[PDB]
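Submission sheet (multi-component)
Chains listed below:
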Amino acid sequence: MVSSYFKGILLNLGLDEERIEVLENKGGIVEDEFEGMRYLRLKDSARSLRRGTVVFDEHNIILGFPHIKRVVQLENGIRRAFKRKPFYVEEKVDGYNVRVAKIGEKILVFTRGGFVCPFTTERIEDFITLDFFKDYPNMVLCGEMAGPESPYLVEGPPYVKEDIQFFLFDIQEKKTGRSLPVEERLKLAEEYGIPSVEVFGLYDLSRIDELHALIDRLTKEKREGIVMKSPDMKKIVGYVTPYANINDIKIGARIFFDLPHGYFMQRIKRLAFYLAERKIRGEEFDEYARALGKVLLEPFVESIWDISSGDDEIAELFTVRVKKLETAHKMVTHFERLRLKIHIDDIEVLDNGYWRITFKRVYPDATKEMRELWNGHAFVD
Amino acid sequence: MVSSYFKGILLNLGLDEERIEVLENKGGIVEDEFEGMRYLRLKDSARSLRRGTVVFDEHNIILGFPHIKRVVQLENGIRRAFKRKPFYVEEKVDGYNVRVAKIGEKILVFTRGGFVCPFTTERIEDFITLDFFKDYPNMVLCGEMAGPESPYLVEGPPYVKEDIQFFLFDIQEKKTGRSLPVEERLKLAEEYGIPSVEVFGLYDLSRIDELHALIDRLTKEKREGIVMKSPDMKKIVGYVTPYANINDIKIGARIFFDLPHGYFMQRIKRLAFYLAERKIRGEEFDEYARALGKVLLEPFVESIWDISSGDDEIAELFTVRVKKLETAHKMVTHFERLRLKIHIDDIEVLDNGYWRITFKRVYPDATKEMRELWNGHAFVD
Ligand SMILES: [Mg+2]
Ligand SMILES: [Mg+2]
Ligand SMILES: [Mg+2]
Ligand SMILES: [Mg+2]
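Outcome: structure written.
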């Protein structure tokens, strides 16, 4: 299942031989390959080695991201996490996270599960100077890839009007995964001109009313929310806008089936706690209730009508821009290896010489369940 | 864990000794007691022995109910289940199901999991002549207990204006669980004056438009739906109204947490498929969307405000009528044994000599989760 080359590295990191065998047999560790370079992916956590960790050799170990906790009640979430101590407040940007690292002579870009993204790996030179990795070869740039032409999302921040952008939110050490303190990370982003998430400033519990006002502005601006970080990066909590919760449901309800457990319920919960904390009542409350009902039902009913004839599969269209047509071929191979059903729908050359690729992503499992129910399949609750 | 008396009975029914041991160790079979009579309850299925089966001796075996499948698309659900053959259409009544049987010299009433209900056991003589069991001691009357003064629900059919009522929907053999054909069951209900679910008539696929019209009438009348049965009772499918799905969410959203998996999602799904099948559009669609958003959010936000001070637990009030105060004491003991937190809030003697008991049922686990989130606990998605 997994080479003794990689199991030897795990042994030297202190994993037990029995744990390695269980991980190997259960598919918790798997081998992958990018441009001929073999590496190990952690599909499950292995003690200190978080899910999404990748191992190329004894030194080139890129730790997966911790799961960052969210609060649904902002004022008490702050009181619990930070008491009255100060914390940085940054934008939560709605994209996909990436880790950028120098591996051998190559700059590689990893998505959350530890896959090398051929698209982002080709594009990352458009956003980050490679000087950073000449000076800090053992550091990992951590950021959100976000915009309207994304390979993995169909939404994004309003201020990215075309293509896609990188937004730094952390700088971590290889092997240990240790985060730089906020201030040092921000100094490095300045020094190397690395685009950053917006840092709104330094706040504390006493400024809760300014933070509510910020959330209200972000909601009207169709932005995702905030991430709250102690200066030493040891305490991190996120809080998202009602816009983010409502729009997530709208996008998801087109598919409905085969989504992460609790996808819709969690966002209904976050909406209810926002309405409760902000004391929203009267007509304003009614507009949220109407919006929630609309985004749950309208996209879902439309897909039912789509599938009800019997030909089509539920689908999402998206576009990306690539420098080389060869990258588009590599993404098709990459999607096929990820067990996604995605094909090229259109291609256009742009006036700057980039290729704009339109992909169509279809959802056969959600389609099957939706169609079986339409066709009268009977099931127990 | 479980007496050799009962394991001997299971052996004679053909269960394997190893299966019995696994069931015993896992708590899939447990012993219970009512008025000094010991019996075995099946918390898990055991081959042919469905969950909720109870065993008192070699003969007094009362089979649990099959899980009756539902369709979410009525016309195609009928086409799939029945093709163009006729089927009976009965009312689905929103209550709790019961099995009534003669055990020794006693008439006992069992709820779905196989518990003897002390309330319904005391009350059942108000609805069914015990003559039936003099003539058919080996038959089980199966019905819904429904009304505004219910120990287990806080909703019910509109035409039960006070107290609670029994509605027969099946007659089954002891030990085998075999259902009588519809016509024989209806003849017996007539002969013994047993109150029945409304039988709307005999229908087929060709009458789908009359069935949609029926569903529309039932929805406006705040009734639950229909159950479709082949005359031989071998094919049974249910279909519920949009009213039932919306009101279920409204009731459930007061608690929200600690409910059956998929409770809300399943009812959102049923609403979407009704809107799609009936081609509901425009203002009519908007009113369903507004209703769905309101029943998800309003009861939930109200409970958050309730718990936000820190004293109260989420609660439901209900009333029942009993002939004897002693029955009220037995229900408290019964609730305590079921791991419910329910106490007596009020008592009133009625002009007919019955006692009206007001109980308060509280939800400590849902309360705890709701309050932790309000108080700022941070969690991953
Ligand atoms: Mg995100
Ligand atoms: Mg989003
Ligand atoms: Mg029911
Ligand atoms: Mg109901």
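Remark: Chain A has three domains: 4-58, 69-240, 315-362.
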